[PDB]
Amino acid sequence: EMRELRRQVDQLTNDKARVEVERDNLAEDIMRLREKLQEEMLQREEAENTLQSFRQDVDNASLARLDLERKVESLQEEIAFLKKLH
Amino acid sequence: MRELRRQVDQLTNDKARVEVERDNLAEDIMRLREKLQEEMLQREEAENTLQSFRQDVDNASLARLDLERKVESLQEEIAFLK
Amino acid sequence: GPHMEMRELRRQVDQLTNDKARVEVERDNLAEDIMRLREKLQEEMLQREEAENTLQSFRQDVDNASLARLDLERKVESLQEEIAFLKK
Amino acid sequence: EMRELRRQVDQLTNDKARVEVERDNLAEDIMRLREKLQEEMLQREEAENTLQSFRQDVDNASLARLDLERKVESLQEEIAFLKKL
Amino acid sequence: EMRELRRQVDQLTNDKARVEVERDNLAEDIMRLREKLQEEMLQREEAENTLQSFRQDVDNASLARLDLERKVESLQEEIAFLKK
Amino acid sequence: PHMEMRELRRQVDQLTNDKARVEVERDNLAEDIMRLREKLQEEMLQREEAENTLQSFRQDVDNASLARLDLERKVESLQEEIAFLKKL
Amino acid sequence: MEMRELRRQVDQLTNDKARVEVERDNLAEDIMRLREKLQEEMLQREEAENTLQSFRQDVDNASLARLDLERKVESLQEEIAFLKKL
Amino acid sequence: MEMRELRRQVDQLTNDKARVEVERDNLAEDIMRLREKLQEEMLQREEAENTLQSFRQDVDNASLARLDLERKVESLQEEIAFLK
Amino acid sequence: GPHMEMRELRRQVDQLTNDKARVEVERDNLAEDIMRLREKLQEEMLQREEAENTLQSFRQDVDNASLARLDLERKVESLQEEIAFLKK
Amino acid sequence: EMRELRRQVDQLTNDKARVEVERDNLAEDIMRLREKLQEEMLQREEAENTLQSFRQDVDNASLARLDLERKVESLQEEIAFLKKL
Amino acid sequence: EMRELRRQVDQLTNDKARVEVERDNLAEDIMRLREKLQEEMLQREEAENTLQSFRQDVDNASLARLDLERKVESLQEEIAFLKKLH
Amino acid sequence: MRELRRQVDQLTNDKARVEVERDNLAEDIMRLREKLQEEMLQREEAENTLQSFRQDVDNASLARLDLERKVESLQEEIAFLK
Amino acid sequence: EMRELRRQVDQLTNDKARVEVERDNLAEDIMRLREKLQEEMLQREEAENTLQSFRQDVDNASLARLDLERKVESLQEEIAFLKK
Amino acid sequence: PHMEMRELRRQVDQLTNDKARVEVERDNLAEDIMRLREKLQEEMLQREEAENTLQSFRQDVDNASLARLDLERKVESLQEEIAFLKKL
Amino acid sequence: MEMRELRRQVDQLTNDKARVEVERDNLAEDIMRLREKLQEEMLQREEAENTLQSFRQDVDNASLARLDLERKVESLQEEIAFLKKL
Amino acid sequence: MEMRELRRQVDQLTNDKARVEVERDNLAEDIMRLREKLQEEMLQREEAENTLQSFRQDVDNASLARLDLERKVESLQEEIAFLK
């Protein structure tokens, strides 16, 4: 039993050592992962902000077109009426 | 003598604590890769949408020329009409 | 002649007026609905973070309880080994 | 006058167009907002569920400890008895 | 007369020597056997306590599976409502 | 020679008394071992049955776990379907 | 694109399932080898203990034989000692 | 249509992975238990092989001593026969 | 284990104590018996020497008595010879 | 403790051994002494017997003398008578 | 008778002379014998005294041996108990 | 004349006295040879007994060496045992 | 007448001479005989006195032999006691 | 011649008287010797018988002496046996 | 050693018995020779006394014969003396 | 066993010596008595042989005297015959 006790001490110490190494490698991995996550969050917000701003010029472009189509439609109505003096 | 049984008790508790640390690091990492991907996901969605809007405004700038041209054509017509 | 063309013009003016009026009402209700929702969202974000922080804090309580139990169990097994060795 | 009627149609057309863009943007924003709100309610419910789970775990563990502390003592007693021969 | 006595002391010395080996073998074997009995009773007690712990886990899971099953159906009712 | 006879017979009676005493002790131990073997055999059988019952119930634990997991996957999946339908 | 996210989880789940299966496979192989060694160690243990129990008889006989001779020496020395007088 | 198939895939894969992780977890717990038994088995075998070699040594020692005591007995008997 | 070896040791201590106590009592009775006997011996030696000295002294009394008788007998025979010669 | 029990057995063994030697020497001395005492009683009895024997011899001799002295005188008488013729 | 008387005187004188010679030779013999007797008595007492003294060292030698045998017996008991930790 | 009968009387008594002296010398000598022999006897007994004891102590001095050796052997054994 | 007388004196002288020799021979022989008678009576008296002295010696020895015989038996009884 | 005759007859008568007296004396002595011889013969016979009886009784004396001696030897021998048995 | 003392007295008693027997033997031989001389001396004594008693007769006759002659001389001288006168 | 034979030997030898010493003592007392008789015997024989030689001498003397007296008688008778 006194030789078996020391056998347990040696095994447990070696197992603690292995778990400690693994936690250390995981602690480094998580540190790197958080930095990357913060980097993507910032890049994600920038893309969403640029898209939200660009929505304004999409609408103006659409309103500009609508404005011209109505202009054409109205001018065609006037020509049709002027020609109708026959 | 009886230090051997104490060392095994104390070692068994420390290993137990480190294995809790390890397993909690593994769980947080799993959650951190999930969120990272949700983030890249939402970003690529915005990049793709914006790129599509860009191509839309560009096309519309061309198409506007043609409308501005048809317009003018029609003012001239009215003038030759009046 | 121009009477009818006038008639169709006046019909278009009225129709555009009713349709514009309807779309504006709809725009007003949406803007008000968004204000209520933003307020609601801010409230839900705050509750969600507090719960997650409280969950993160309690995880220590879980680990400590679990290690405490593990330590006692090792203590039981060890005492039993000491009984076994004393009997021999 | 037709000139004034026709410009009224023109001006109403544009103005309607612009309120419709405004309408559409608000709807799109309402939908994203509702979708965000849903994801936050889910995330909170899940945190609250896991927490109640952990709380029962801590409670079981605490009562288990109570029984184990009593077994420790009984075994100390036994060791002391054995020690006195 | 004296020789017969020296015989009997000799013979009893050996006979006692032999029974003492018999006794000490019985007592050793008894010690091993009480040791084994105890290990078996411990091992059974651990098996029983762990089983009972698992049984509580399964009883809980049965109640928790009812909550999950009920959430499932509410959600299907919601997809149905959305689909009309 | 008288005294030597006295010491000889003294050794005989003592050795007789000690052999007799050790023989009684051997007999009591022989009885104890028989009952103890019987007890050990019974306890081995009960231990094996408890471990067999534990080993079989492990399946019940796993199926309970998988059933829950399947249900949890189902909940989140139905929720994803709802979120997609709402954005249509 | 919800489809983009779905196929993304399908691929991840496939790689994750494959990795767990590899781990489960190695454990099953490891378990088979370990059971075999256990059966061999149990067989060797039972044979050693049986041989030990049998040999205990030889130890007892040997010790009792020596004890007999020692008593015989002591008895003879008493006999010579008495002859030296009467 | 294609979407419904993808989400069914994800669910089937989630449950199949779940089942394989339960299998893995149970294999790890078994292997640990088997490693423990194996240690206890070699332990007892080493202890038995150690006692046996110890007993072999005591037999041999008793044998060498018996050899030597047989001759002291022989000498002491001749002494006596000369005396008587 | 050590319990039994302890038990046999304590049995040996008690047995040696009773046996030592018995031998000492026997030693005391013998030492006292020797004192009485030495005293007795001294007395018998003294009486034996006095008797032998008294025997040695009385031997003269025997010799003198015997020679006295012998002298008278010679005197009788001589007187008878004188009577015989006177008658002749 | 076994160490103290075992030294107690050792010390009792030696001490018993020494009292037994003392016992045996006293017995041997008692026997020689009794054997001496016997030889002295015999020697005295024999001296006393021979003495009583001698005493009867002296007594017989003394009474014999008495009778012989009377025979001497009777013979003197006879010689005197013969002398006077 | 007067010639017979002188014959008795001569014979008795010669007989007295012979008895006197014999007593004289016996007186010398007894003197020598007493001296020898005293010499043997002294030598006898010296032997008995030397034997009585030597009895002490016989016993000590015997007690010394007993002491060593018990020592061996006790040491063998201790070894047997230390080896019994199996 | 009558001196002859007196001389025979007186001589007969003297011879008688010397023969008593002689016979008493013979008796004492017989007793003195008996005691002398008892003395030599007791002496030779002591010389023989002592000689036997001597040979005993000498043998025991040898045999003691062997016991002192077995002893030591066993102390070493215990030490290698502890 | 005178011659006859001288004859008778002569004859009587010789006859007396002869009877006187006869007498003196008888008286001498009587003296020897009284001498012998006395020696015989002395020798008988010595024999009788010595015999009587021997008879007392034997009577004493008879009583003394009883004491010795009694000591013998007591001593045999003592050997018997010692032998058990 | 007358006187010579007177002296002659005087010698005859005296010689006759003396012869007569001596003859009487011889006769008385002859009688005495006969009785004396008879007495002597009787006394010789009694003396021889006394000496014969003494000579025969000497045997009785010796046997008495040897009997005692044998008994004395027996006593000391039994005593030696007792002394040897006591030292065993 | 009581046996040593016993054989010691046996040997002494044998030598002492032998010496007494030699003495008894010489006395028996001496007695036989002495008896013979005694018988011879008795025979010579009786013959001398018998011859003496017989010769006493010759002595008496011789003396009486001489006495007769002396008386005869005295008587004759008386006869001559008387013849010388008447 | 051997001891019992030795002590019986000593006793038999003691009694046989005793008997021979009685024989010796009786022979010495006899020889002394025989020596005395022999002296008394030669004594009387010498006395008788001495008297006889004395008587022989007196006879011879008486014979020589008778011879001489016969012749004085012869002379005195012749004287008388001459006278008458």
- The string of DSSP letters for F11-49 reads HHHHHHHHHHHHHHHHHHHHHHHHHHHHHHHHHHHHHHH
- For residue I34, the distance in angstroms to the closest alpha carbon of chain M comes to 22
Q: Which candidate, K4, K80, O74, A18, places its Cα nearest to that of I81?
A: K4
**Do F69 and H18 meet the contact criterion of CB atoms below 8 Å apart?**
yes
Q: Which candidate, G33, B23, E53, C76, places its Cα nearest to that of H30?
A: G33
- Distance between CA atoms of residues E62 and I9, nearest Å: 65
Which chain K residue's Cα is nearest to H46?
K86
N83/J35 CB distance under 8 A: yes
**Do A82 and B81 meet the contact criterion of CB atoms below 8 Å apart?**
yes
How was this structure determined? It was done by: X-ray
Residues 6+ apart with CB under 8 A from C30: D23, D26, D27, D30
Helix (DSSP H) and strand (DSSP E) numbers for chain E: 1, 0
List the structure tokens of A16.
Answer: 């603690």
- Distance between CA atoms of residues M39 and M24, nearest Å: 23
B16/C71 CB distance under 8 A: yes
Phi, psi of K84 (to 5 degrees): -75, 0
**Is O19 an interface residue toward P (CB < 8 Å)?**
no
N65/M62 CB distance under 8 A: no
- Hey, which chains touch E, using 3+ CB pairs under 8 Å? C, F, G, I
Helices (H), chain K: 2-83
Between helix J2-83 and helix K2-83 the angle, nearest 10°, is 170
**Do I20 and J15 meet the contact criterion of CB atoms below 8 Å apart?**
yes
**Do E51 and F53 meet the contact criterion of CB atoms below 8 Å apart?**
yes
3 state SS of O1: coil
User: Which whole-number Å values give the CA distances from A84 to B70, C5, E70, in the listed order?
Assistant: 21, 11, 73
- Distance between CA atoms of residues B20 and B41, nearest Å: 32
Count of structural domains, chain J: 1
Hey, of J40, J42, J45, which one would you mutate to test binding to chain N, going by the most N CBs within 10 A of its CB? J42
**Is I72 an interface residue toward L (CB < 8 Å)?**
no
- Distance between CA atoms of residues N40 and M37, nearest Å: 5
Q: Between chain B and chain C, how many beta carbons pairs sit less than 8 Å apart?
A: 24
- Hey, which chains touch D, using 3+ CB pairs under 8 Å? A, C, F
- The string of DSSP letters for chain E reads -HHHHHHHHHHHHHHHHHHHHHHHHHHHHHHHHHHHHHHHHHHHHHHHHHHHHHHHHHHHHHHHHHHHHHHHHHHHHHHHHHH-
3 state SS of F88: coil
User: Which whole-number Å values give the CA distances from D20 to B60, C28, D24, F11, M65, in the listed order?
Assistant: 19, 12, 6, 128, 179
Residues 6+ apart with CB under 8 A from B48: G1
| Nearest CB to O67 within list M2, M6, M17 | M17
CA angle K59, K63, K64 (to 5 degrees): 115
- Distance between CA atoms of residues O53 and M25, nearest Å: 10
Between helix C2-87 and helix E2-83 the angle, nearest 10°, is 170
Residue D25: give the domain boundaries: 1-85
**Is H37 an interface residue toward F (CB < 8 Å)?**
no
- Distance between CA atoms of residues G71 and G49, nearest Å: 33
Element (H, E) at I20: helix I2-87
What number of other Cβ atoms are within 10 A of residue K74's Cβ? 16
Chain centroid offset of residue F64 CA: 29
Hey, of N69, N78, N82, which one would you mutate to test binding to chain P, going by the most P CBs within 10 A of its CB? N69
3 state SS of B2: coil
3 state SS of N88: coil
Residues 6+ apart with CB under 8 A from E13: F15, G67, G71
F80/H15 CB distance under 8 A: no
**Do L60 and K62 meet the contact criterion of CB atoms below 8 Å apart?**
yes
Phi, psi of D26 (to 5 degrees): -65, -40
Phi, psi of E67 (to 5 degrees): -60, -45
Residues 6+ apart with CB under 8 A from F26: E19, E22, E23, E26
Q: Which candidate, F13, O11, O1, places its Cα nearest to that of L52?
A: O1
- Distance between CA atoms of residues J63 and D42, nearest Å: 164
CA angle E62, E68, E74 (to 5 degrees): 140
CA angle M21, M24, M30 (to 5 degrees): 140
Note whether D touches A: 3 CB pairs or more under 8 A: yes
What number of other Cβ atoms are within 10 A of residue L46's Cβ? 19
- The string of DSSP letters for G19-74 reads HHHHHHHHHHHHHHHHHHHHHHHHHHHHHHHHHHHHHHHHHHHHHHHHHHHHHHHH
Question: Torsion angle, CA of J17/J20/J26/J28, rounded to 10 degrees?
Answer: -100
List the structure tokens of K12.
Answer: 């008795």
Judged by CB atoms within 8 Å, which residues 45-64 of P form the interface with O?
45, 48-49, 51-52, 55-56, 58-59, 62-63
Q: Which candidate, E48, M8, I60, E13, places its Cα nearest to that of N5?
A: M8
**Do K71 and H42 meet the contact criterion of CB atoms below 8 Å apart?**
no
Residues 6+ apart with CB under 8 A from F85: E79, E82, E83
- Distance between CA atoms of residues J41 and J53, nearest Å: 18
- Distance between CA atoms of residues J47 and J52, nearest Å: 9
